[PDB]
Amino acid sequence: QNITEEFYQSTCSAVSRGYFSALRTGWYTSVITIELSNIKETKCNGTDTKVKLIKQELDKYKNAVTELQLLTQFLGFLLGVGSAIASGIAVCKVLHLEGEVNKIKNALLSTNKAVVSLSNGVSVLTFKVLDLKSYINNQLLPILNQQSCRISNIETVIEFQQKNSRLLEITREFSVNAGVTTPLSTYMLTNSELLSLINDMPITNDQKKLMSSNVQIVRQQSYSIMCIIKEEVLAYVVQLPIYGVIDTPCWKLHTSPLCTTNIKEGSNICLTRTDRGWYCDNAGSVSFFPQADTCKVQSNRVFCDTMNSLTLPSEVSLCNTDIFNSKYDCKIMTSKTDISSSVITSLGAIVSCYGKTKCTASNKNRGIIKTFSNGCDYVSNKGVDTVSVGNTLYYVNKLEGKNLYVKGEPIINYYDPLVFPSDEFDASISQVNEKINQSLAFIRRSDELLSA
Amino acid sequence: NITEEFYQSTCSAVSRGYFSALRTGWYTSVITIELSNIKETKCNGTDTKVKLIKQELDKYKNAVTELQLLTQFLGFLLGVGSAIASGIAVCKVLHLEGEVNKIKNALLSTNKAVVSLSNGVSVLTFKVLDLKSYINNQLLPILNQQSCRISNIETVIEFQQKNSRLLEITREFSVNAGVTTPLSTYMLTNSELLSLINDMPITNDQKKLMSSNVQIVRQQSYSIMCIIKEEVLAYVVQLPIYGVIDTPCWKLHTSPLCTTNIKEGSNICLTRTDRGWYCDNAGSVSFFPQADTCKVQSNRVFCDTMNSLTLPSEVSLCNTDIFNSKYDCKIMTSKTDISSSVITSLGAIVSCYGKTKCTASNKNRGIIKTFSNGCDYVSNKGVDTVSVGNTLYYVNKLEGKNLYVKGEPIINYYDPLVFPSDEFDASISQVNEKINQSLAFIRRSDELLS
Amino acid sequence: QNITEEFYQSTCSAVSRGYFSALRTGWYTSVITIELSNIKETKCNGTDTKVKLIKQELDKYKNAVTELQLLTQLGFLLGVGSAIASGIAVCKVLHLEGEVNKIKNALLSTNKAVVSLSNGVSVLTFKVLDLKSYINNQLLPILNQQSCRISNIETVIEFQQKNSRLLEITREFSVNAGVTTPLSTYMLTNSELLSLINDMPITNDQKKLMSSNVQIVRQQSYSIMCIIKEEVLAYVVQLPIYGVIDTPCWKLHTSPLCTTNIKEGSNICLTRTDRGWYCDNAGSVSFFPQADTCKVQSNRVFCDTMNSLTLPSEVSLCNTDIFNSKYDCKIMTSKTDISSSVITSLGAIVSCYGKTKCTASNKNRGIIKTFSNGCDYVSNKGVDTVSVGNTLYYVNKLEGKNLYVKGEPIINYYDPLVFPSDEFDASISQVNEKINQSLAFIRRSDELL
Structure with missing residues (x-):
């Protein structure tokens, strides 16, 4: 059946919708x-x-x-x-x-x-x-x-x-x-x-x-x-195994690092969604499988093991459309490591291109068709067979399916450098915010001391 | 004949009585x-x-x-x-x-x-x-x-x-x-x-x-x-050559310990990072952090010392007194209020937070315990299964004595807004001094006001 | 099969040079x-x-x-x-x-x-x-x-x-x-x-x-x-298709570096996080962080580019000058003062701290050198085995040239109480700004009293 993928330029993430569930809830x-x-x-x-x-x-x-x-x-x-x-x-x-x-x-x-x-x-x-x-x-x-x-x-x-x-x-x-x-x-x-x-x-x-x-x-x-x-x-x-959950809506979330692109070699700031993985509806909640290879996909059915899962509220899905929503605290990581890499999705590929790195999407009969400028971008698998990031050549999945480019200003631009908490690994939208609020008060307090 | 102890104060479990068989060399x-x-x-x-x-x-x-x-x-x-x-x-x-x-x-x-x-x-x-x-x-x-x-x-x-x-x-x-x-x-x-x-x-x-x-x-x-x-x-x-045999070995299980507050976002979490295997060896303790590095047969733990660190015997105090002044107990911090459960050798630790449903059930009677918010523990005797949300956990069916040691959860001793909530391999004293360093900036910044 | 290893006491790291590349660049x-x-x-x-x-x-x-x-x-x-x-x-x-x-x-x-x-x-x-x-x-x-x-x-x-x-x-x-x-x-x-x-x-x-x-x-x-x-x-x-062959490739081994002061619980630690394989590739360096992603045969390293990052050539400066102003060397910080040892290609790195007994022994002679607290290194020539605590490490028996490069340990250049001691993937420049921001708050507060 048809598989739909959505790319969010705002958060440099991708959600592949249309998959169905087959969750192992027990043992016989x-x-x-x-x-x-x-x-x-x-x-x-x-x-x-x-x-x-x-x-x-x-x-x-x-x-x-x-x-x-x-x-x-x-x-x-x-x-x-x-x-x-x-x-x-x-x-x-x-x-x-x-x-x-x-x-x-x-x-x-x-x-x-x-x-x-x-x-x-x-x-x-x-x-x-x-x-x-x-x-x-x-x-x-x-x-x-x-x-x-x-x-x-x-x-x-x-x-x-x-x-x-x-x-x-x-x-x-x-x-x-x-x-x-x-x-x-x-x-x-x-x-x-x-x-x-x-x-x-x-x-x-x-x-x-x-x-x-x-x-x-x-x-x-x-x-x-x-x-x-x-x-x-x-x-x-x-x-x-005994599969107690069959045929519920299920989707896959792909994420990639999102960094600023400034002229200064070392002065860039990065942000990455850590909530990557599979999400299946289940009994009014959402089963989240963080580990990537815990599920095997056959056609449209995703065979998974609940043992490797967390139980999250249905409001988790808002992190895809509105990462700053006031009902669920979206999990994100921060870094100053602006390293270029690529994420192959179900119906395409996310490309985070930074520095002087060479980033390319190619067709087998056409050669290079798109050269990525610095930032986070996304390409559909339709006319594309191959993607090149640096010295690493990625083959793209060749599954026909509907793509959707969601325009938005990259979230990494919303933070002022020099005050950015740049060593958080399992933090969240609000958690980084309060650490920013604590750092801005520490800057007021140091400048209130220079005043005397 | 294995004895397990649960510490409500630190939301951890120690299974005592195992014996050693450590691979110290190669033939x-x-x-x-x-x-x-x-x-x-x-x-x-x-x-x-x-x-x-x-x-x-x-x-x-x-x-x-x-x-x-x-x-x-x-x-x-x-x-x-x-x-x-x-x-x-x-x-x-x-x-x-x-x-x-x-x-x-x-x-x-x-x-x-x-x-x-x-x-x-x-x-x-x-x-x-x-x-x-x-x-x-x-x-x-x-x-x-x-x-x-x-x-x-x-x-x-x-x-x-x-x-x-x-x-x-x-x-x-x-x-x-x-x-x-x-x-x-x-x-x-x-x-x-x-x-x-x-x-x-x-x-x-x-x-x-x-x-x-x-x-x-x-x-x-x-x-x-x-x-x-x-x-x-x-x-x-x-x-392999097993140079160390029949010395005491015990297991420490850890699970996140968070406050259970009615307010949506104002909870703080704490987790012991010293999970793993502990065997006495030559007056010290051989520590194996990753679970799958050791295989258990009956009462003997077969481990490889190459995947171990050598720690003093005083490491055991973190089980009985996490605040002891003789060993700096290793801890991680988070504001990640996530429910989960860890199956022990003789039971299950259950971290129940938020609106998650957490339950302990028996196979012949159905649901037998409803968990209130917080970290709690149940013995494997009358319990066969444990369910946390959408995850069904089967418990080990090994007969043995359990001990629930009451104590106030350590996370309650901390006031939020001043809690350093991003520490991965820090310790009780490292967190204490980090608060003490933030409180010194709190005392002294208001003291310079005239 | 001529391999040269260099150990840098300043940064407690080791580089095994002379290996060649064999990177899986494509598929057939x-x-x-x-x-x-x-x-x-x-x-x-x-x-x-x-x-x-x-x-x-x-x-x-x-x-x-x-x-x-x-x-x-x-x-x-x-x-x-x-x-x-x-x-x-x-x-x-x-x-x-x-x-x-x-x-x-x-x-x-x-x-x-x-x-x-x-x-x-x-x-x-x-x-x-x-x-x-x-x-x-x-x-x-x-x-x-x-x-x-x-x-x-x-x-x-x-x-x-x-x-x-x-x-x-x-x-x-x-x-x-x-x-x-x-x-x-x-x-x-x-x-x-x-x-x-x-x-x-x-x-x-x-x-x-x-x-x-x-x-x-x-x-x-x-x-x-x-x-x-x-x-x-x-x-x-x-x-697999190996499109990049015979380029220079080297392995970097690192081990935690802590101060050796008399106070039991007051110590500071530092570790280079850029461990792994580095092969020259297309004017850049193909970096494989994961250790077991590559298989070694003599001097050829078979790796898969898919699990690699592409780094600038200036990465090599972190071995020779950790404070260089052209590449931000990756480091972690801690107060976790635990002794351990790292086996290299042509020897063994030993991070010896606290009251731990650390020893390197020969099969025919027994103990030959007793390590003092700090990070040190010994060649595989006269040494057959190394023991740290209850952990027995065998050394590789590959003939090759070794080099002990003396230097003052970098961990001593920092004064405690202002050291950011919970950084997991931070860098030289990241630590400096955090120290200067905490030290400037101490300068301006004490200059006011």
Whole structure:
């Protein structure tokens, strides 16, 4: 669908509107199990190319079992810290409780899908993915038993190593990630299992369809937690996201440093909005995600994690149209560092050009089409493919969409130098103002002293 | 058995009772694979079997050449290190003339040897795969007999299985610039690691700890590719050495502490910047600021001293007395009245300000606590979930004793309009003197009035 | 490989000179294709041991194919980029109706072709694996003739290897949301990469660099999966282009500098904030503040210009004259009197303060020098290890020329009580005006009494 971007020359910022939300508000926990069989010994005394292949494969299996038993014994800093897998670990604590795994085992004996009531009070979906027990006991061992371990068919060796392959890779991922893997691999959960788990979760059909349409993102926001291998069953807990907020209006704010352009080399003053990031409407409030890469965009849907969010009033949006509005204190940073740089937006690029820096926008068939004068400016991605700032060449996003240039006098011109508080990092419109008011009284007080 | 303490005065939490396992040094070991380089594949007869062994042979012949090509808050004060300077030094010695022969000849009869390098250093060496003796005496003879027509498909399957470990090791190096971390199981199997652990020059206390938590050891290890020369492939495994064990370790969590005034803009905030891990070590405290630099297993904290500063034991007074005259407690200031929550080991700190809705809930009963404006704390026993605005936080489910220590929030001791509200790495005494310097200009400017 | 390091005691900073540049200035995009054949359904019955392996192998192929159709729908002052804006632009062209057909028709006769896309870009296209003609004319006839009884095991093993690369590429794309980095060997083999290196519009000197350090190339590349339609699978590979090579490049290490006075809590600190890599580029200096954004091989520094700022050449004066009147050297101020050490390319910087024990030791001799309070530096020649408090730092063992440049510590030139001690990204000139404004208020107030 159409995406609309607005550029504000007054504040040297850009807002990309039209995106839709898909916020991860919670976690759903599922128990994934594989059935194992304890092999005491292979009494295979006859050795040949086939026996050594099946035996070494068996050694890899018994070694994987042993390995797991050992395993089982701007802004952004203002966000709140969480425990990503605190939910899954809680399930581990119950599965570690006496006789709890057996309850799961009895439910998964006849079918591969069951809801089990855990001892605490929680009903959880349980899933038997691989049945290695019944394979090793009644498909492999009889062939071995019948011909006294001289296996006539090479096919058994090829197939057996394939059935064991999934187990060895699951072990590797857990063994290299300290029992916690992310994203959820295809070895962790096959697509057929994942889609079926999506289909069986207690959520709306709108949510089921969303997760099934973007199974790739679901995988990336999930965890796999190794849990327990006891009583002929190994089980790990998969922790899937649940998206409670879908299809709410959402927009992205891009900002770039705004500096004065004076003839004197070192006497310039800068101002930068620090409220950059994604903003989604939610239940009368606004979820603000300061960290840039906390969200992944697919078409028009933004898949985000609320864990990296702040909850702000709806009045936050006024900072885009009126940064000095009297209802929300817009967050800004100050500097005297007039360094040229560029900000690539969704439908264009912001260019803050200062000093003698070379700033250029180019078309692939046309070359340079615009040379930026000093100040903060903006260009649409329509006729433009490339942007050049200094020695850094930026490629622009090539997404068709509506652009809007909002004229205005740069806010940095509204402050008188020499009285500018030039070392504020997480300040605001009013916060800088009062520090100015404190500096102007200190100047009156020093001049009132020169008077005598 | 971990005890947590919450200080309402400073809106912080301290979890006491953890034990240490600090990586104080590095041990370097040389892991080798003996290879034989195939001169040429002259298979002239074409068949589905010949094409299978030839491509399998080519993949091996490619890995050797491929690897051979490869062979030619706070925190800002933390000193910078060189993680693999130890491994790089060991690599550099193996490159010396006639040095590989010393390595090769020692591992010719056994798979474990201590080799004295020309400089002076004895290193543990390990021959894991002997592909040379496989290729020369079992595979190459089979191939030559019928001009590459293998009657038993088992041979190609055995070769591809025998060849698998080499190719997988190559692939990790091929995507990670010759330096892998954590240490994969293809680099060093669990069986080899415990055996290499058992042979390291450490206490039995150190061996048992590492052997019981080989998973964490893997995450703090490096694999450094070095050389393929004279039909021998070798890479250096750099394992951590835990010189400091079982000393006390505690965690300090911090969250912004602001006033809760009815007036929209007149609130002031204060936050302790000393968040992180604290372990006693040699009479001092080892401080690790960033959360993800340490990994916890049960009651032990595995950390790397390279990401630490060394602080006096008096740092602990900031938890019990932020105004103590023996250590200058580190603080940041703001006027940013933002609500947020920090999940502790045994609970959650909740900073609730403005019109934000802050709630603590249980899974079986729903909402159980409604937070009033200010910084407060709830234990994880009867509480399962914590919600701050649009953010749903799950709490840790670890049983343990908690302690709510009443005290007046420190932010109330300050009068606004005179509060310096832009300090990032300042301290109680730094803020005090900055007010004292502003009040001296306040006293003296009115005193000069006549 | 001759590297010279200079340590400046006045400013507690170190410059490692002699390194050369290799800046990623542009992007090259190539489209790699695999020809597929979609089976309506394998209508073979799944029971016997021979059928179950080939039939299951066929299902793993058909599921990976189906999966792809589902999927196919300092430092803070830096500027933000779009890393794959170039690659996404190319992929977007392939989604237009009937656009893929131009690709297919060109790669019918050769495995390498330059195709005219309908929109605007000419891209190299590459058919690596041909699964179509194998499935259509070698496997399925063998399978169909004997009613899924594959009597000869050799055919199925060849298939699973021929099928392997697709599943591995599919598996990687399935874990990285269609965008992978670094570029794996399943994405692009060395044989393919070196041949693709040879066709890029660069000089032979640039070509030779990329082929000699193919490992770094992989780490600065992306693979973008985007389309599987009309019996063709294609993804865009985005390789770096190093337009600026062999320019002088140097690394600046800095460590906090505090006074060493007897009073425990009364101390003042100062730190140069302009740490990072500096390479000459187009008469200016390309500055990389982030340390791990560059990878070092011998004397070549592979960096990405996208995370860099462009600075005037006068930046180098901050190493030689921190008070120079031509460039405003960046510094931070504090009262956080904490001891620490900085490992350089050819040695170690040690900021030793308070009652901390600071020591540099040799492996064969033990402790050789005990550091007094202040910021100091020792060469990697006679020194093997350095210890500060409970933190053990290993020094790099690279031979190279070192230079201890004596000078009075800059922190001593300032009188406390007028020192602005909470500046995070301030400068020489910024501190001076704040001192003069506070000292003029002290001059005029005391001159009145």
